Amino acid sequence: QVQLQESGGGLVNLGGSMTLSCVASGFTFNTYYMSWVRQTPEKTLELVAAINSDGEPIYYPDTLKGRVTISRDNAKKTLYLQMSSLNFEDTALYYCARLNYAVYGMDYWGQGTTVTVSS
């Protein structure tokens, strides 16, 4: 069974930095591209980052290129998201999702992890 689990959410400091983790199981992690999607409190969804099998970022929103980093440790079967200079627009629910080629988008999502920017 395809399972994704995000961790590391909570209260983060304004202007600070964080590392979100996503642990995958039930599929060959390394043969798949991965992404991070966030859901703001408005219920609006945005693709934060995409990474290929090989651990190379294939996409970042223009608005985020600079304070966002997506990496993977295939060996750990973990996907990471690192954001710096957090602002209040960073307050959202973060999900890791798998990019299925046939669908040509996300087929499986994790449960989510909540990041609450504070001052």
Partner: protein, 112 residues
């Protein structure tokens, strides 16, 4: 950046009802070689989104046959023949026809 307008944002239903939710693309999805890469995700409250229908009409794993998708170009639809309780959540259309992958505003299927 392509805008996916979903109408109605709120659709109060009675169970056993036939629903149709709309998703309009700001740009044609048949403008490239990635012809109608329009998908639908359900997000029941507390749970993570689930792929419902991908590529306009292709039902994904775990999806009942009462769900169907249609449309092409900019006007896409999603029907639920008989609406059950388990169908109630938030519906997001999405597109991967054009970079960057974009999500809709959502249609909230709620009981009345």
């Amino acid at each position: 950046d392509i805008e996916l307008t979903q109408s109605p944002p709120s659709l109060p239903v009675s169970l056993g009802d036939q629903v149709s939710i709309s998703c309009r693309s700001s740009q044609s999805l048949v403008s490239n070689n990635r012809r109608n890469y329009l998908h639908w995700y359900l997000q029941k409250p507390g749970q993570s989104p689930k792929l419902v229908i991908y590529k306009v009409s292709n039902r994904f794993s775990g999806v009942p046959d009462r769900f169907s998708g249609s449309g092409s170009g900019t006007d896409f639809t999603l029907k639920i023949s008989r609406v059950a309780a388990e169908d109630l959540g938030l519906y997001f259309c999405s597109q991967s026809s054009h970079v960057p992958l974009t999500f809709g505003s959502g249609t909230k299927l709620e009981i009345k």
